[PDB]
Amino acid sequence: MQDAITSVINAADVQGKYLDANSVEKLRGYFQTGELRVRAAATIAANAATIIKEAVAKSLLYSDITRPGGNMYTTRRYAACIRDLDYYLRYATYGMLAGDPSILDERVLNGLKETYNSLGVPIGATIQAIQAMKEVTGSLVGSDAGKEMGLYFDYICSGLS
Amino acid sequence: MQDAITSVINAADVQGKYLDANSVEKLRGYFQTGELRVRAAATIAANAATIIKEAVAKSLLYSDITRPGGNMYTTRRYAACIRDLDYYLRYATYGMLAGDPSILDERVLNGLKETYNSLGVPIGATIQAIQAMKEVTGSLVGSDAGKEMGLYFDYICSGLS
Amino acid sequence: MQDAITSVINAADVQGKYLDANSVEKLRGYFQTGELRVRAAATIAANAATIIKEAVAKSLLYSDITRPGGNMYTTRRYAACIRDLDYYLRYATYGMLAGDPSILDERVLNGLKETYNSLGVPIGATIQAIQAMKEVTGSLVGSDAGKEMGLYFDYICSGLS
Amino acid sequence: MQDAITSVINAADVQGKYLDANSVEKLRGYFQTGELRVRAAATIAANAATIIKEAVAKSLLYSDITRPGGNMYTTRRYAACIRDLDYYLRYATYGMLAGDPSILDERVLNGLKETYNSLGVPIGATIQAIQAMKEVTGSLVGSDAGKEMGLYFDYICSGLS
Amino acid sequence: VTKASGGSPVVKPQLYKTASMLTIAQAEQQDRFLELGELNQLVSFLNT
Amino acid sequence: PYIRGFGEEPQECRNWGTQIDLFQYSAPFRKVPQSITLFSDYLKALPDQ
Amino acid sequence: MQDIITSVINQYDLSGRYLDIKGINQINNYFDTGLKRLMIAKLINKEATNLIKEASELLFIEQPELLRPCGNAFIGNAYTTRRYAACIRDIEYYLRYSAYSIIAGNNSILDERVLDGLKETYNSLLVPIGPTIRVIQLLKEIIQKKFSTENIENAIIAEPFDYLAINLSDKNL
Amino acid sequence: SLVTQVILSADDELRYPTAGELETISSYLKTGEYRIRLISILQGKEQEIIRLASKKIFQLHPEYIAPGGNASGARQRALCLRDYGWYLRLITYAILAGDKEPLEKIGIIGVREMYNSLGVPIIGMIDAIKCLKEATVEVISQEEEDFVAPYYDYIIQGMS
Amino acid sequence: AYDMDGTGAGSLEPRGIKSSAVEKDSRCFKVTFVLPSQSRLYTFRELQNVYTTKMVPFSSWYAEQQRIQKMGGKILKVELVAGGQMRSVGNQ
Amino acid sequence: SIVTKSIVNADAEARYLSPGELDRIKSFVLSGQRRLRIAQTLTENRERIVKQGGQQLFQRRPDVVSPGGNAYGEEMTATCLRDLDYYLRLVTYGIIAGDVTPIEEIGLVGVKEMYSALGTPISGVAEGIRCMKDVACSLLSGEDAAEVGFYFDYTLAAMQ
Amino acid sequence: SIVTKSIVNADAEARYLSPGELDRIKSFVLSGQRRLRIAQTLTENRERIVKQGGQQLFQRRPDVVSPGGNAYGEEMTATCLRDLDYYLRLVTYGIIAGDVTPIEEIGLVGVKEMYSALGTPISGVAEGIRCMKDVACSLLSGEDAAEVGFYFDYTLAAMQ
Amino acid sequence: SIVTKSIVNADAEARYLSPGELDRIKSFVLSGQRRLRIAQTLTENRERIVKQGGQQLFQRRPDVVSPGGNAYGEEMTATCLRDLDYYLRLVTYGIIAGDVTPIEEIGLVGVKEMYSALGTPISGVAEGIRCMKDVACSLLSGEDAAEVGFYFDYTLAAMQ
Ligand SMILES: CCC1=C(C)/C(=C/C2=NC(=C\c3[nH]c(/C=C4\NC(=O)[C@H](C)[C@H]4CC)c(C)c3CCC(=O)O)/C(CCC(=O)O)=C2C)NC1=O
Ligand SMILES: CCC1=C(C)/C(=C/C2=NC(=C\c3[nH]c(/C=C4\NC(=O)[C@H](C)[C@H]4CC)c(C)c3CCC(=O)O)/C(CCC(=O)O)=C2C)NC1=O
Ligand SMILES: CCC1=C(C)/C(=C/C2=NC(=C\c3[nH]c(/C=C4\NC(=O)[C@H](C)[C@H]4CC)c(C)c3CCC(=O)O)/C(CCC(=O)O)=C2C)NC1=O
Ligand SMILES: CCC1=C(C)/C(=C/C2=NC(=C\c3[nH]c(/C=C4\NC(=O)[C@H](C)[C@H]4CC)c(C)c3CCC(=O)O)/C(CCC(=O)O)=C2C)NC1=O
Ligand SMILES: CCC1=C(C)/C(=C/C2=NC(=C\c3[nH]c(/C=C4\NC(=O)[C@H](C)[C@H]4CC)c(C)c3CCC(=O)O)/C(CCC(=O)O)=C2C)NC1=O
Numbered sequence A, B, C, D: 001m002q003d004a005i006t007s008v009i010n011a012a013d014v015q016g017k018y019l020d021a022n023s024v025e026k027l028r029g030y031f032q033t034g035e036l037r038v039r040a041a042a043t044i045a046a047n048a049a050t051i052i053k054e055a056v057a058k059s060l061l062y063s064d065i066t067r068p069g070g071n072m073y074t075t076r077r078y079a080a081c082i083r084d085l086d087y088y089l090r091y092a093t094y095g096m097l098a099g100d101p102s103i104l105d106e107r108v109l110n111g112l113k114e115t116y117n118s119l120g121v122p123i124g125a126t127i128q129a130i131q132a133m134k135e136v137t138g139s140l141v142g143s144d145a146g147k148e149m150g151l152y153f154d155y156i157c158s159g160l161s
Numbered sequence E: 001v002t003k004a005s006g007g008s009p010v011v012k013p014q015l016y017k018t019a020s021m022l023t024i025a026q027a028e029q030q031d032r033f034l035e036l037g038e039l040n041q042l043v044s045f046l047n048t
Numbered sequence F: 001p002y003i004r005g006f007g008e009e010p011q012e013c014r015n016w017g018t019q020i021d022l023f024q025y026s027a028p029f030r031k032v033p034q035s036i037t038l039f040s041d042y043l044k045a046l047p048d049q
Numbered sequence G: 001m002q003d004i005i006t007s008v009i010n011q012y013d014l015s016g017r018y019l020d021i022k023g024i025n026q027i028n029n030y031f032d033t034g035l036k037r038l039m040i041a042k043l044i045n046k047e048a049t050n051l052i053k054e055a056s057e058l059l060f061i062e063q064p065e066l067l068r069p070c071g072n073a074f075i076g077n078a079y080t081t082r083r084y085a086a087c088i089r090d091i092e093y094y095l096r097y098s099a100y101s102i103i104a105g106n107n108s109i110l111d112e113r114v115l116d117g118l119k120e121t122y123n124s125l126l127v128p129i130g131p132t133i134r135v136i137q138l139l140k141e142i143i144q145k146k147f148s149t150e151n152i153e154n155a156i157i158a159e160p161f162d163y164l165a166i167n168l169s170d171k172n173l
Numbered sequence H: 001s002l003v004t005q006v007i008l009s010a011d012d013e014l015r016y017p018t019a020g021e022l023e024t025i026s027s028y029l030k031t032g033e034y035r036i037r038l039i040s041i042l043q044g045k046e047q048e049i050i051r052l053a054s055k056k057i058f059q060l061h062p063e064y065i066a067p068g069g070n071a072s073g074a075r076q077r078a079l080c081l082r083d084y085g086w087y088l089r090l091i092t093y094a095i096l097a098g099d100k101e102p103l104e105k106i107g108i109i110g111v112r113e114m115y116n117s118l119g120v121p122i123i124g125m126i127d128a129i130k131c132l133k134e135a136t137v138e139v140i141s142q143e144e145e146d147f148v149a150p151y152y153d154y155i156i157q158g159m160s
Numbered sequence I: 001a002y003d004m005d006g007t008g009a010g011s012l013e014p015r016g017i018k019s020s021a022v023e024k025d026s027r028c029f030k031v032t033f034v035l036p037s038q039s040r041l042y043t044f045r046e047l048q049n050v051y052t053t054k055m056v057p058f059s060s061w062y063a064e065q066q067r068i069q070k071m072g073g074k075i076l077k078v079e080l081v082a083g084g085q086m087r088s089v090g091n092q
Numbered sequence J, K, L: 001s002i003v004t005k006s007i008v009n010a011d012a013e014a015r016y017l018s019p020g021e022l023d024r025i026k027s028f029v030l031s032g033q034r035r036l037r038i039a040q041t042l043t044e045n046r047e048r049i050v051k052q053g054g055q056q057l058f059q060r061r062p063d064v065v066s067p068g069g070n071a072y073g074e075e076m077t078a079t080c081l082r083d084l085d086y087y088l089r090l091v092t093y094g095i096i097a098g099d100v101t102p103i104e105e106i107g108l109v110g111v112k113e114m115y116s117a118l119g120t121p122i123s124g125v126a127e128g129i130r131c132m133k134d135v136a137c138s139l140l141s142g143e144d145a146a147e148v149g150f151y152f153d154y155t156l157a158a159m160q
């Protein structure tokens, strides 16, 4: 659980040296985007339910995982999805603010693909839901902010694959 | 890989005792249906291609998995289906003769639902194909023989679910 | 968790026989050293902090695991060491009294080398700390008592390797 | 896969320093026991089949793992045991010559307890077979050589536990 | 048939106590060294 | 609260291995969930491995 | 768990269809033997403490090794009365969960509450699997002694005890 | 009773009673008087039955009656019939409230430690209840004794 | 967060104790009660005193008070030692 | 069903089934002939029970079908009736299982999360099931209408 | 059995079972009545088939029982007959399975590793099974002795 | 940092970040330009901040450097100043992280166990950091000295 400042301090500390010009050079780069990330995390908090409603209706709403036999049939199983998609849109918001994807594999990625295989959850439909959820997130926060929030979505999709 | 006789011998052997009246009582029950299973496996061997042609046309022939984007669009993907449905109708024939579904999970069920999730094969449409294939199999072999062959189809559908 | 008397009773009981001359022959050998073990465990309880302070300063105090980047850099990580070395000097005291190393692998050794690999703790520096801790323990309790307490230190070092 | 000389060279090399007095001090200690280990490995090679025949008859020959239902009933399963016990007596001979148990976990211990749980092999009876095999090995090679060969048996028993 | 498995670790069930035994275990259970009483406790049994 | 060990209480056959794993110092490093996968594979078929 | 009914209804839900008549014929076969499944269960409650006692003596009369010292294999058979007390306790469970499972008409309660980890638990304590399964069917013959003149109660009583036997086996064939 | 088990069992889930449970109350209340008619049959045969229970519990177990046994003496045997009277009185409660709690909140929960502190052999009391159930069959016809049969052998299962 | 997100009947997490406690609530009661175990005679565990008087928070008094009566307990006295009354903001 | 949760109740309590539990498994299986007749009536009346079910639902809630309603157009109205076919199916399961256990873990657990996440008014779908209930109980006698209606109103209760 | 390996044969070949395979499963199950009679003869003749089996084995191989032989003394001779009781049991399995598949994976696969690792002369145990074969075929007619002897000599072949 | 624990605070509470949390991440990053200037002052003043730091430390605690003190001789005095270079480095981390989280898990957690186990007087090293604080705040203006001194006294508080 490290942000961009924590990761910069760790690497500069792990060699026992002070924060030289290169370490502060990245820190200044993070502070420049500090204004963009909060507004990105602002609108995502507002439209959390709307984004997840848009992703599932755009990716896996009417596919036969939704029908009987599919992986999402029963109401408990459907309700687990939007609960499950809420974490991906939420933890991706944390990575967008912290500027470092360490929180994702610390709290989301580890034991995740090994868990879906246990339950039999289709990893293929899961990533496309996150990809569609990444597509709507670029709608709200804009282009570059979508590039930032989108940079952690595919990090989840990559490791979850 | 045990038949009804192998399973009866195993349970009677695993306690180190001889084949008492209860163990032979089930064995006599299996030999009584020995005449029914061969004729059931006889006609299924004859109408193997006809049964699979009837199931796909009755369950998933014109659904939008068949159309572009659906899970069965390309000719390689369509040809994999009837190859894939052939195993279900074939291994179910083996379970019907052996009188024990041990061969199914040994050679079909294990790593199956975990494989379809990898490829992204819809488990919902798969079971309905096997259900429709179970429906036509009761047409050929009769009622009770269909009850026997049908008893292993839903075993595949249950574990594949 | 068996002492020398528990292990002697177990082996004599596991064959269903009484305590013959050979079983009591070892038990008499344990009672002869009963006076030595208590005084050995006496002084080790007194100089617990002094022994661990001597071992770390003699083995791994100034090596670059102590410096930044090394495995023992931060104060939480340094404080975990003397907490960690306390168990080795403590559980070895229990084995010295019980006269049987069953308590070590029961409560120390199992999942230990598999845990240090998870944390990334250097097993090489760990054993040399215990070896140096074994060297100072022979100083206090004497030669033969050090031979007894030393006999369980390398048991930890062997299994932890 | 390191012997005592390889482990001494590695630790002296990993700090980038030459072989000082402490590194050569252990190497001289290994060369002193070089004569003992070969004669220990000599007789064990001669009485390999006799030692394994003595261990199984002394530990698990007549227990109900040997009878029907037990874990060792069928001749394939019995034959796998003496094949399996041969590795423990063989790889322990390698550790006794190399003076370092690195070869055991490299080639025996890893994936071993995770494999016996898959097959359903009783780890409890396995360790007692190795303990009985350790007891007969101290008969042949003597006391101190048995202490050396015995030091790697319980290393297998510890990690296999 | 059971399609999963938690593993079977080597467990030795308890059989009895001994005077040499349990107060090696009581001081163990608190994660503290042997105390003078329970360690003088271990002594005078081995003098028997 | 104490740890309800094996020689404390009538244990159950279903979480025998896992509970003995959980009552160890090695417990806090199985970062993968040991129990939710084990209780779920009890119902599903054999996995691919 | 799942009885014969809920197991039947999940069979038709996975396919997402209503209950046809082949589905209802399976339910009717339970409702016919359902009244017969109870006095089997009611006989067990009246014969419970006895039926464990005849099973133990019939077991140890063939396995005298189970009442003897283990050998150096630290194996859990009925050596000591502490071992004997807990070892009779397991026969309690095999009669109990095989009594519910007679009423459910389905072995769903058996495997998830008895079979799951059974080889796990016995491999830890080194418990006999061979004699453990043989006592399960000594109960089966003992219970079938009461209902013997006809033979449609016999298949009902055999189904739970036979399921534990085939499943606790390391598969020789 | 049975309604109390449904109110309790539905109360720990914070919900009203479901469709199946309200059957279990409705079917129980429709079989109401037949328990009421049955208990009056048994109350008129309590002096009937306990006299027959002392028949076979003591011809089976003369150890207890003999000098040295617990039941030796008049006043020890005097309460001996009283314990049958309380048990038979408890079963009339259990036959009415159609479940086992009046046989379990009283009588069964902790019965062994009661007897073990009294000297009564707990195995002998199991045969005493089994003797009591053997005695109730004679003064009761075949229709209604299997209605009362499952209430007896629960006591035997509770005592072991 | 707080226990009143929208959960009620027919919702995914199971129907349970729902307290009207705000975010990080700082109100706590001083309660007094006896709670006989009613389960020691088939478990045979050691005995513990059942008459307790302790400070329970407002965040979880209702669950505790709902549970103390679950096992036949009797509540002799409770008070709100820490916190205000009718206070819109400030319970945090 | 009543068989599976009467077991798991007595399963948790470390005991067997009481007469109160075994005289109801007994009472339920003799009831099984009458249950299949009731479910057989609703099985091939789904054409009228659903279509007339959505009849009163739109007359009572024209907002959901009006432009802007969730079930607006040819598309959503078809799915608007699809859910009623689901819940009518689960009631046939509950009647044969003698409990809402099939209806519990299908269509009831976490149902508010689904319909809130679909934008559907959960109160509107509750109105739909009530309209189906009047059509269903109109197809059966009074003794049956106290059951078939009995499972609908449980679904009404959990759906709000 | 013939049923399980006629399946796994056609299983591997991606096909169903031919008439050659299904007219023999058919021919085997009609043979099943006669197989149980044959196995029933050897089942309760193990007292004579084993004890007379070890009769000729010691008269033909006195070395194995003489002092120094593997089966020397009261102990090993009991186990000396125990293995014959094993192999006589597996022949009863092969007769009912219609194949040596039960005898294959029990007592035949890797048998030379066991007996070589036990110090037992594997040729000696082969002589024991041949002595049992003459006793077994002497208990049956000519049509049966071509079967019961037929499974022994397969065990003789694989045991050397 | 303030960014990572404002997250893990709102992480545990199952919620997003409030305006109180997001108007301070916002307020902190605009503060980031001024923080790097402050840490840049202490970065290349470690020669004067450490050496004058150990200046007043020995004048105020001559015991630790006198013969018998822990930092006695040419050797320990070099390490005597090494730790001050450590803690001066961690204060530069805390200034840039806007919190003592870097100083918390480095040099503060379990610090009393280390220095007690090294024989070093923990009060003596606390005196050393206070001497560095007067040198550090003497190098900056009043607005900055309320920060750079602010992190030292936290280290003083946790170090006793
Ligand atoms: C914070 C990191 C994190 C994640 C991600 C997580 C996932 C997780 N997802 C679960 C289930 C589930 N997840 C799904 C999800 C899906 N079905 C589909 O078809 C889609 C592809 C997908 C939605 C995108 C379903 C249906 C279940 C229920 C499975 C069942 O009841 O068997 C469960 C089982 C327990 C429960 O939901 O209460 C866990 C623990 N846990 C974590 O700690
Ligand atoms: C009673 C048997 C037993 C042992 C031995 C044990 C060890 C153990 N050592 C640990 C950590 C540790 N152990 C060390 C030890 C060392 N660093 C070095 O350079 C040296 C080679 C070594 C000191 C000799 C360190 C630095 C950590 C902290 C690791 C971290 O924060 O990542 C941890 C992680 C949790 C914690 O400390 O709170 C455990 C569980 N647990 C047990 O139950
Ligand atoms: C070199 C390190 C190493 C080891 C140790 C090893 C073990 C190993 N033991 C096996 C089986 C086995 N192992 C046993 C062993 C035993 N049964 C008992 O009751 C005893 C407790 C125990 C003898 C001491 C048995 C019976 C099998 C056969 C299991 C089966 O057929 O299901 C198998 C399966 C495949 C085969 O034997 O061909 C492997 C791979 N592999 C390795 O690479
Ligand atoms: C509901 C299904 C279920 C079963 C069956 C079960 C069994 C079970 N059997 C046990 C022990 C045991 N079981 C036995 C049994 C036997 N010894 C023999 O020699 C005979 C073969 C056998 C009697 C038939 C013995 C001796 C122990 C104690 C082992 C020891 O401490 O030495 C234990 C450990 C003690 C405990 O109960 O906490 C468990 C959990 N648990 C379950 O949940
Ligand atoms: C409502 C449930 C309930 C019961 C059953 C109960 C029993 C009970 N039985 C007692 C004594 C006794 N009970 C017996 C009993 C017997 N001797 C035999 O041979 C028989 C098998 C058996 C009677 C059928 C004897 C001999 C004593 C006197 C022991 C003594 O004090 O020396 C006592 C001591 C005082 C007394 O007699 O009242 C109690 C309290 N209390 C209860 O609340």
Ligand SMILES: CCC1=C(C)/C(=C/C2=NC(=C\c3[nH]c(/C=C4\NC(=O)[C@H](C)[C@H]4CC)c(C)c3CCC(=O)O)/C(CCC(=O)O)=C2C)NC1=O
Pocket (backbone or CB within 6 Å): I018, I019, I020, I021, I058, I061, I062, I065, I066, I085, I086
């Ligand atoms: C099962 C028996 C039982 C009851 C009845 C019960 C009541 C109870 N009512 C409470 C609060 C409350 N109760 C009310 C109720 C009202 N306001 C009004 O104006 C009305 C007159 C009244 C509604 C009828 C309010 C507003 C609170 C919140 C008080 C606060 O936040 O300070 C609380 C504090 C904790 C919480 O709600 O989480 C409890 C414990 N607990 C129980 O165990």
Ligand SMILES: CCC1=C(C)/C(=C/C2=NC(=C\c3[nH]c(/C=C4\NC(=O)[C@H](C)[C@H]4CC)c(C)c3CCC(=O)O)/C(CCC(=O)O)=C2C)NC1=O
Pocket (backbone or CB within 6 Å): A057, A061, A062, A066, A067, A073, A074, A075, A078, J064, J065, J069, J070, J071, J072, J076, J077, J079, J080, J081, J083, J084, J086, J087, J106, J107, J108, J118, J120, J121, J124, J125, J128
């Ligand atoms: C067996 C339990 C169960 C239920 C109930 C269930 C419901 C369910 N309802 C859905 C859609 C829908 N449901 C409605 C429903 C309604 N519109 C209205 O105005 C009315 C108030 C209401 C019906 C009476 C609409 C309009 C949609 C489509 C929403 C959209 O397209 O965005 C969908 C997504 C599409 C699909 O896969 O069918 C599911 C999964 N699934 C289940 O497994």
Ligand SMILES: CCC1=C(C)/C(=C/C2=NC(=C\c3[nH]c(/C=C4\NC(=O)[C@H](C)[C@H]4CC)c(C)c3CCC(=O)O)/C(CCC(=O)O)=C2C)NC1=O
Pocket (backbone or CB within 6 Å): D057, D061, D062, D066, D067, D073, D074, D075, D078, K064, K065, K069, K070, K071, K072, K076, K077, K079, K080, K081, K083, K084, K086, K087, K106, K107, K108, K118, K120, K121, K124, K125, K128
């Ligand atoms: C079902 C297939 C199967 C077989 C065949 C089998 C054999 C087997 N034979 C054994 C011993 C033995 N077997 C013999 C046998 C013989 N001595 C002679 O002179 C004769 C040539 C020969 C018998 C005809 C002897 C003497 C021993 C004891 C050897 C010893 O004590 O060292 C043992 C070890 C003790 C035991 O557990 O019984 C096994 C496992 N196990 C099996 O599962």
Ligand SMILES: CCC1=C(C)/C(=C/C2=NC(=C\c3[nH]c(/C=C4\NC(=O)[C@H](C)[C@H]4CC)c(C)c3CCC(=O)O)/C(CCC(=O)O)=C2C)NC1=O
Pocket (backbone or CB within 6 Å): C057, C061, C062, C063, C066, C067, C073, C074, C075, C078, L064, L065, L069, L070, L071, L072, L076, L077, L079, L080, L081, L083, L084, L086, L087, L106, L107, L108, L118, L120, L121, L124, L125, L128
């Ligand atoms: C980043 C946080 C951090 C700290 C603080 C730290 C301290 C630390 N101080 C040490 C030694 C030492 N530290 C001192 C310190 C002092 N003597 C005095 O009189 C003064 C009161 C005091 C200094 C102001 C001395 C004398 C030694 C050597 C002790 C010895 O040789 O026995 C050592 C062992 C040698 C080494 O590896 O440097 C460590 C690890 N490590 C860390 O990671």
